[PDB]
Amino acid sequence: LKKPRRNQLEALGVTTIDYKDVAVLRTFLSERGKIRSRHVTGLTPQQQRQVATAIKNAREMALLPMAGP
Amino acid sequence: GSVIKKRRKRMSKKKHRKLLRRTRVQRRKLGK
Amino acid sequence: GIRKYKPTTPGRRGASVSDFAEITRSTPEKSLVRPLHGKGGRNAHGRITTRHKGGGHKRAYRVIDFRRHDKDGVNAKVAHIEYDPNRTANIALLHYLDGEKRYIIAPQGLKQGDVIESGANADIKPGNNLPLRNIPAGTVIHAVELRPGGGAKLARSAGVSIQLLGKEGTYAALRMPSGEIRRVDVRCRATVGEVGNAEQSNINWGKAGRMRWKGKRPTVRGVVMNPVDHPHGGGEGKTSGGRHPVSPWGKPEGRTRKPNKPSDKLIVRRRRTGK
Amino acid sequence: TMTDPIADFLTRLRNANSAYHDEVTLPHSKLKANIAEILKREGYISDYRTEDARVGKSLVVQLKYGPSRERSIAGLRRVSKPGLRVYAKSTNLPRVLGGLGVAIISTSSGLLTDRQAARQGVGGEVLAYVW
RNA sequence: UAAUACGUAGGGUCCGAGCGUUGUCCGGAAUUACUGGGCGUAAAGAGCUCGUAGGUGGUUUGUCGCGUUGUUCGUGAAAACUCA
RNA sequence: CGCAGAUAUCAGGAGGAACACCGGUGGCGAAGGCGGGUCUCUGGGCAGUAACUGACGCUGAGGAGCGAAAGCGUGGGGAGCGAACAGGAUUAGAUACCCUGGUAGUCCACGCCGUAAACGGUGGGUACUAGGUGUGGGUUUCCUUCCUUGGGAUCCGUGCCGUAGCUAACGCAUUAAGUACCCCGCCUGGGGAGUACGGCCGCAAGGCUAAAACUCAAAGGAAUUGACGGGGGCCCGCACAAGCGGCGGAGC
RNA sequence: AGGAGGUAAAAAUGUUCA
Secondary structure: OOOOOOOHHHHOOOOOOOOOOHHHHOOOEOOOOOEOOHHHHOOOHHHHHHHHHHHHHHHHOOOOOOOOO | OOOHHHHHHHHHHHHHHHHHHHOHHHHHHHHO | OEEEOOOOOHHHOOOEEEOOOOOOEOOOOHHHEEEOOOOOOEOOOOOEOOOOOOOOOOOEEEOEOOOOOOOOOOOEEEEEEEOOOOOOOOEEEEEEOOOOEEEEOOEOOOOOOOEEOEOOOOOOOOOOEEEOOOOOOOOEEEOEEOOOOOOEEEOOOOOOOEEEEEEOOOEEEEEOOOOOEEEEEOOOEEEEOOEOOHHHHHOOOOOHHHHHHOOOOOOOOHHHOOOOOOOOOOOOOOOOOOOOOEOOOOOEOOOOOOOOOHHHOOEEEOOOOOO | OOOOHHHHHHHHHHHHHHOOOOEEEEEOOHHHHHHHHHHHHOOOOOEEEEEEOOOOEEEEEEOOEOOOOOEOOOOOEEOOEOOEOOEEOOOOOOOHHHHOOOEEEEEOOEEEEHHHHHHOOOOEEEEEEOO
16 A cells, blocks of 8 residues: 555545544645645545545634645 | 638738728618 | 516607516505605795706605614514605515514515514514624625614615624724715614615616606706806807806815714725726 | 448458458348358358357358468448449349459349349349459 | 740641631549549538438338339330441 | 835735646536535436336438627626736837736626637547557456455546558547448638628627639648758857957058 | 756848849
8 A cells, every 4th residue: 555556545544534534634735734646645536536625624614724834 | 731821811801800990880871 | 677668659769667576565554654745846945955856746655664673572574565656665564463564675585474573683684673783794784873773874775785894892884885984883773685676776767757757857057057047157159167067056076075074983984986 | 320230241341351350240130141141152251150149149250361361352342322222233233343253132032143143134232242 | 146935948747628726515624523532731520519301220020012123015206326 | 106104024904806735648518618615406427237118219401509718788896917098118110029007808697799720620320440558437356465546357438659451641540530331511723702792690899691703823731852040959160258469540 | 866947138121033
């Protein structure tokens, strides 16, 4: 389960992606508070899209920052 | 293909539309 | 909405009229109908003070409740929506559950059967009347009091509304239809929503007679008067006045608001022009 | 959609013969089977099987090539197409390739070449030229 | 200014009581392509769909015999064309 | 623009428009086109099952609808951008490029318009014809870690490469420009001209249909060789740069 | 090899057959 194949969210640690699980969404963020791409995460397009939507909802509810710095 | 074929039609159309803008009111007084 | 007449006559070519669609009753409530008589733009002296008035269709005054203070917690249902010639808006006949019948300004979105609430514990719905202390910011309101108990003065015409921007203390800031931002005591009451019959502005009255029915007498221009009558008067042939624009009493164009007024401190930003 | 399985059959044949395939499987029709029989008799193919598919029946044409992969067929050409049906009288039958070819003719004496049709004095619908 | 393209001479050639020109039609022209064309860039795919009329029609049994095909009769004037 | 306190910086407020990262040879859509989030309503597609009907299919003249952007109307809105416009600059001149501003417009609502390099410059449907390699969606299956975007088989897509074949060539090449069938649209030398006249549509702009006279003996497409480039790369030369000495000015 | 962006401002034209 390496970077080019790390879709843990499909293989193991298969967590229903939620806008509340900031402990999960922090790994799919940069220090600058930006979303990480598939090429770095390892996610399928479905899971990346769900993570992105999760992050945006979390940002709208202040569980994550827009422009962290 | 080449753009000369575009440019010929371009010039024809440009001159025609200039003529129309120039004769707009004459054409209206005549048609209408 | 609007019904555009067909051009069967030149007095009806581009004319339009309201499709009195949100109206439900042709007749008013007799108990709430006070009489009216025209004035002709004439005052106690019998002299024209406001020109361009008179003739006019006969009218009757529908007693509107601009002071909805005595029915707090006493709900009503909109029994009817009716035409009012005294105003551009339509008017909603409310039946209070205590048996009182009253008229209001007929906001947008309001229909028969809609339940109207009054007071601080009312829902923020069209037609509901509340204090601004209880209305939240960013809300669209109408029929606002300038003073507690003074009655609704602001945002009464058709299609118009006020935007409550904020409340800081005992003063609520209101963007008015003119764009003017001003402060008003939170104790002042406002009806939630925007006024109805917003289509009214888009009516083409088509012919002179129609405004003669509405009570607007003909407006004569000064440049065709004589100089004894108007500063712009005179001139062989047409003229643009022969001077800068003025009233018939020589007052020029410009701000006529009295300075040093009490309202100057409540007003935040006068309206804008040109932009 | 499909509009003439005869042309479909000729095209499967032509393309497989171009690609040097040895077999050609396709759907079955009695007419296509009779055509395949004519081609077998005139020596343009090796054999043809009629077998059962999942739903209906299939034709499996075992094509023919020489020792150096000489294509036993050099051409196929549908003639009586839908949209333009061509019919030949017994006199003005077509000579395919100056006679070295074979024109498939549908007649009430059955399916038979232009040679057989001129022999029997009949004509009909010209389905194909299969030189 | 050094013309086998003009004009003339010789000479040659094609025809021959004709020879040339003009006009008209067909051909060449597969250059409206049925036989017998094409459309990415040469002219040429409607901006895309829906859908009417129309055109077209998978496998199969039987029948009609309309198309189709065979044969025969009548007609298809004479002249023409063609063969003798 | 500021020095009347700008820029900058901090705080607060108003408002408009667009939605960074995710986000790409990626997905959806008939095309146009669609990117903040949520909710509501809604369309289409794909796979699998094979329960159903039983050729009901394909195309589609005309016709109808949809149809980027600009534009038009009415009514709102209008932060930024910005035709026009105005200055400034450059310039021989600059109705331009550049700068400073800035109106319509861009935005919303309802409607008109109905065009575009609306392009894959490639009509739709069907069947067949070597493979390889990516990637998207789904079904299954086999090593089995029985971890598992480990692989395979298959359906639908979307890309790159590459056969045969085709092509004037460029190139297309199972997403054909191949092999074939059905249907539609369109072409028939370049200009004139997609113009006029007429008609239709349209508020208008203009669009759609659509010629002729006259004129040329070409217009064109692809590719080759050169030349050229205020294209690129590499390298040279008193070519420049660094220096010395001159000419141009005097007389002869 | 692993990793921001850039600048050349403007500067026109070319009788003859060829």
